[PDB]
Amino acid sequence: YSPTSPSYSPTSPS
Amino acid sequence: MQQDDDFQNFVATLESFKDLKSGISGSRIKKLTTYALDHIDIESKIISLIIDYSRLCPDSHKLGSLYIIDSIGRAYLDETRSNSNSSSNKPGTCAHAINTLGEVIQELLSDAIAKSNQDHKEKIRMLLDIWDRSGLFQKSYLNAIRSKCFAMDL
């Protein structure tokens, strides 16, 4: 797991 | 959906975001972006809410709001880029939402970096690096960091 749920980045808003 | 899935999802999600510390979980961003992108019938309300959400809240929420503004902003930008003034009427909506963030993005970034440590700074640097890498943004529209000093000089 990671500090985010689900994982998200500025790579894609969707 | 039901009458319990109104703007209540957006507000209650942003509230639950404020209620917590550390971690920028994408699920809350998904709920916010979801209700925004679901129909686009609210602009200045959604935007005033996320900007002021950053305004009233601690450092974790400056970064969190940058990621929320990032998802809704990029999604709005693509959605209105897919549209044209020759196929639309009555100005407003997500176009004006971006236009409104355009008057606060300067203080949102500059404070979000100045409030940050090396790690959060570098994350903000990476966010704007991906904006520049995507080619979806251009020069003289990202000076918001009050020029490169903030996260771009080091």
From Swiss-Prot, chain A:
Entry's localization field: Nucleus
UniProt note: domains: The C-terminal domain (CTD) serves as a platform for assembly of factors that regulate transcription initiation, elongation, termination and mRNA processing.
TM segment ranges: none
Record's protein name: DNA-directed RNA polymerase II subunit RPB1
Family: Belongs to the RNA polymerase beta' chain family.
Source superkingdom: Eukaryota
PTM summary: The tandem 7 residues repeats in the C-terminal domain (CTD) can be highly phosphorylated. The phosphorylation activates Pol II. Phosphorylation occurs mainly at residues 'Ser-2' and 'Ser-5' of the heptapeptide repeat. The phosphorylated form of Pol II appears to carry, on average, one phosphate per repeat. The phosphorylation state is believed to result from the balanced action of site-specific CTD kinases and phosphatases, and a 'CTD code' that specifies the position of Pol II within the transcription cycle has been proposed.
Protein role: DNA-dependent RNA polymerase catalyzes the transcription of DNA into RNA using the four ribonucleoside triphosphates as substrates. Largest and catalytic component of RNA polymerase II which synthesizes mRNA precursors and many functional non-coding RNAs. Forms the polymerase active center together with the second largest subunit. Pol II is the central component of the basal RNA polymerase II transcription machinery. During a transcription cycle, Pol II, general transcription factors and the Mediator complex assemble as the preinitiation complex (PIC) at the promoter.
Location of this fragment in the whole protein: 1556 to 1569 of 1733
Sequence repeats: 1-7, 8-14
Gene from which the chain derives: RPO21
Subunit annotation: Component of the RNA polymerase II (Pol II) complex consisting of 12 subunits. Interacts with DEF1; the interaction is direct and serves to bridge RPB1 to the Elongin complex in a DNA-damaged dependent manner. Interacts with the Elongin subunit ELA1. Interacts with the Elongin subunit ELC1. Interacts with ASK10. Interacts with ESS1. Interacts with RTT103. Interacts with SHE2.
Curated annotation (Swiss-Prot), chain B:
Domain CID: 1-153
Primary location: nucleus
Cellular location(s): Nucleus
Biological process annotations from GO: antisense RNA transcript catabolic process; CUT catabolic process; mRNA 3'-end processing; nuclear mRNA surveillance; sno(s)RNA 3'-end processing; snRNA 3'-end processing; termination of RNA polymerase II transcription, exosome-dependent; tRNA 3'-end processing
UniProt GO cellular component terms: Nrd1 complex; nucleus
Top-level taxon of the source organism: Eukaryota
Keywords in alphabetical order: Nucleus, Phosphoprotein, RNA-binding
Anything else known: Present with 19600 molecules/cell in log phase SD medium.
Summary of the function given for this chain in its UniProt record: Plays a role in sequence-specific regulation of nuclear pre-mRNA abundance.
Protein name: Protein NRD1
Gene: NRD1
